[PDB]
Design a protein around this nucleic acid. Structure first.
Lengths: 156, 208, 225
RNA sequence: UUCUUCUAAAAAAAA
RNA sequence: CUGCAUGGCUGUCGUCAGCUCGUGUUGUGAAAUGUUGGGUUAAGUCCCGCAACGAGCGCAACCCUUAUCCUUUGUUGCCAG
RNA sequence: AAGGCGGCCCCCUGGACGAAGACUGACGCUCAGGUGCGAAAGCGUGGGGAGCAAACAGGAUUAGAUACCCUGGUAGUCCACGCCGUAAACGAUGUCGACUUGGAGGUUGUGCCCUUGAGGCGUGGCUUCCGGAGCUAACGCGUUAAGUCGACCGCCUGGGGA
RNA sequence: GGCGUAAAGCGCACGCAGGCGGUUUGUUAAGUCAGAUGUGAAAUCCCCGGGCUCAACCUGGGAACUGCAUCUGAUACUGG
């Protein structure tokens, strides 16, 4: 049911008395092709075990993003430690205009038409954190209407 | 190489000898040589058949060798056809009357020699070494073994520099003498050289 | 269901010294007489009733609730209270990961169960005396730490914490797993993680026995329903 | 209390 | 010829007491915790405490020899009456 | 205000803070260029020179020792008037104003209650340490912000060259 | 976009020119906003069509040229 994407796999290291110990880290994202998406970061000595840990961590701690019919609902910007990210809704059939980790997380998150841009450092972990941060605090018309106590027609 | 051989260090505690006979010093050397010839010939002939252990014993000037294998149908074929063919040539090589018995090996996935030959054949037909190691360990742990550790060494995945990889699930106590650690090795003659495989299987502590 | 006069006799209104307060607990503090804070019972009572009501509601659906008190001033009181009301408790040290890492704590409770069967009815004596003492001590400490939850089967449906600050690890695990928290929170504790805040003293014997009797009463009534 | 210096070529993994 | 392409075997730090993993938690992260602390040991040996709970390779025991006694067996071994 | 200021007494003198009022009525904040103040070393002129001490000499250590250590010792350190205008001139954090949980002190006023002893309850100025949200690459900052804002100025655009 | 530690707060202050300015009322309409008029050559860019077999290319009409000047009006904010 859920679609899982592997974003970046790199080899981290650790020096001990014996010498260098090489470990692997796996950044993956999972989602239901709709408002549910979540990212996982796993680490192990082998890449299959790393990707498996990442998928288990990704399937938990997911969030609900109040998205439109196929796009976002307003231009929103997010930040997490090095990646000022900005994204806005686009018309039908323009695709996912995004780079690196952003493309994978958006695609799995179900949006199909979006203009995005990554400022600052484009580190994959930080941008996928910042992207879901912006998505998490993205207001919806019903939420803002109920929040301010007015009708959705009054706010349009 | 630092660790002593597990079967050797346990030869008088929980592990039996693979040749149990008596001989004075006059005929000890030629007896040992005869055992080597029959073992070499059998290992060469029964390469396809999964042979696990060749026990040799010679009571009253007549050699009797009992092969322990997991595929008796393959080694006998039609009833009484090639077992006699092996017995006559073994008797001719040793120069003494022979007799060949066959013991079936229940659960071949928990036998150190058979797992080594399986891994070595898979290596020779070029599968991923990691895949072979994982398959062997999972199969062994599923059939009820108290622990297995496998190690593969040398020019893995066609690399330029050799390395050693090993996995271990469960207990493999090598210092405990009463633990019946079944240990065996093998080697694969791949096109990039020879790769060595070692396997320790811990079946559970033996009391007495 | 619980008045104000009984609480005042128990000592619920007493808080901690002024140098130690925590500012997130300001709405429930009446004032400070003799350099010690006083909780306003006129505020603690109307929300304690809602907490007891919610606990009755969750009890009537045959839900497992977990009691957490380790201060040594409430250890016996929580143990006899939980047994009398047929619930679960942790009266000694809360081992970290007891809820989140339940996958291994299940193994440890299983170890406790087979070991106690071996000891009492299995009769696993007639071997070396030093090994028997080692197994006895292992079972003793394992029971001492995990006896109250040794037949729970799965993670509970609610948590009742005696001290919100001292038992911060349990509250954090519950929030991590989305399990509701009902807690007796003093003036020096942090109530953010708690879903059902209950202001009041968590140090006096009188007060703690009063709270435990009240929650035992409501959970028993709900189970009876 | 004093106790200086070691030029110039390495290799490491990729479900 | 190439141990600087290797298998197998061995030295070496060193029989020094250390080296890791699963799950959980903290940190964006490399990592940390466990494995640290108070005692104790030859020892990461054991107890208490403790966001850690457990497990594995190692630390000890199971093996050989030597030291005491008893039962069986006394020749080619022994000589108390 | 910064550099900085330590026995006691006198003369002249600047700034800061507190309690009650009264008064003028936006007169305010910042500031390129400009001006003033600005540790220590150094310069000029005239004094003074006990101790300390660049340079220098001698004695040690060392393979060497134009140094560290020892014995002496001159500019200088001190006074009067000018010049120089530079420091890790640092809180490595420009000035002014508003808002945002708290704890323990130091120092300096001042109001009330019986100063029922050196007690209790407030309210101002400066200042030290810890810490919540929040911010930060992290360390940390955290009502004296590196938080949330507004006004003005100076400065930065890879390292070396510089 | 930044200036504690990565490059970056002048050593500190006073202060002319310059930038900004608490709160209430009246007046003016310069800044600002609305409408109208004149102008912003043709081509080029964009929209809907037409002609070379299509396309490049040519071409009809519209939009755009975010600007400037004048007239009339609005007075909340800034300025007098």
């Amino acid at each position: 049911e859920l679609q899982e994407k592997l974003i970046a796999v790199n080899r981290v290291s650790k020096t001990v008395k014996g010498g260098r110990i090489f470990s692997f880290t796996a950044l993956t994202v999972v989602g239901d092709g709709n408002g549910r998406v979540g990212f996982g970061y796993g680490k192990a000595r082998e890449v299959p075990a790393a990707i498996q840990k990442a998928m288990e961590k990704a399937r938990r701690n997911m969030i609900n993003v109040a998205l439109n019919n196929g796009t976002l609902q307003h231009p929103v910007k997010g930040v997490h430690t090095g990646s000022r990210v900005f994204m806005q809704p686009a018309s039908e059939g323009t695709g996912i205009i995004a780079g690196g980790a952003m493309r994978a997380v958006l695609e799995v998150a179900g949006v199909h038409n979006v203009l995005a841009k990554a400022y600052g450092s484009t580190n994959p972990i930080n941008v996928v954190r910042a992207t879901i941060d912006g998505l998490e605090n993205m207001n919806s018309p019903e939420m803002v209407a109920a929040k301010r106590g007015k009708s959705v027609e009054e706010i349009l | 190489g630092q660790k002593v051989h597990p079967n050797g260090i346990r030869l008088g505690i929980v592990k039996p000898w693979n040749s149990t006979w008596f001989a004075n010093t006059k005929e000890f050397a030629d007896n040992l040589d005869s055992d080597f010839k029959v073992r070499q010939y059998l290992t060469k002939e029964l390469a396809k058949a999964s042979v696990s252990r060749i026990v040799i014993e010679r009571p009253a000037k007549s050699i009797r060798v009992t092969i322990h294998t997991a595929r008796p149908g393959i080694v006998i074929g039609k009833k009484g056809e090639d077992v006699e063919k092996l017995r006559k040539v073994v008797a001719d090589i040793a120069g003494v009357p022979a007799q060949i018995n066959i013991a079936e090996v229940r659960k071949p996935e928990l036998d150190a020699k058979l797992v080594a030959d399986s891994i070595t054949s898979q290596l020779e037909r070029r599968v991923m070494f990691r895949r072979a190691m994982k398959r062997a360990v999972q199969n062994a742990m599923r059939l009820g073994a108290k622990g297995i550790k496998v190690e593969v060494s040398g020019r893995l995945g066609g690399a330029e520099i050799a390395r050693t990889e090993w996995y271990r699930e469960g207990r493999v106590p090598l210092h405990t003498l009463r633990a019946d650690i079944d240990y065996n090795t093998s080697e694969a003659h791949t096109t990039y050289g020879v790769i060595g495989v070692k396997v320790w299987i811990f079946k559970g502590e033996i009391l007495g | 269901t619980v008045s104000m006069r009984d609480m005042l006799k128990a000592g619920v209104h007493f808080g901690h010294q002024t140098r130690y307060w925590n500012p997130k607990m300001k709405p429930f503090i009446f004032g400070a007489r003799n350099k010690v804070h006083i909780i306003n019972l006129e505020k603690t009572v109307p929300m304690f009733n809602e907490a007891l009501a919610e606990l009755n509601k969750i009890a009537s659906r045959k839900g497992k609730i977990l009691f957490v008190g380790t201060k040594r001033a409430a250890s016996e009181a929580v143990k006899d209270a939980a047994l009398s009301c047929d619930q679960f408790f942790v009266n000694h040290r809360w081992l970290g990961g007891m809820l989140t890492n339940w996958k291994t704590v299940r193994q440890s409770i299983k170890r406790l169960k087979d070991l106690e069967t071996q000891s009492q009815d299995g009769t696993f004596d007639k071997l070396t005396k030093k090994e028997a003492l080692m197994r006895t001590r292992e079972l003793e400490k394992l029971e001492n730490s995990l006896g109250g939850i040794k037949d729970m089967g799965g993670l509970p449906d609610a948590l009742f914490v005696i001290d919100a600050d001292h038992e911060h690890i349990a509250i954090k695990e519950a929030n991590n797993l989305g399990i509701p928290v009902f807690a007796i929170v003093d003036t020096n504790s942090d109530p953010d993680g708690v879903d059902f805040v209950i202001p009041g003293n968590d140090d006096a014997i009188r007060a703690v026995t009063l709270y435990l009797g009240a929650v035992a009463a409501t959970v028993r009534e709900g189970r009876s329903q």
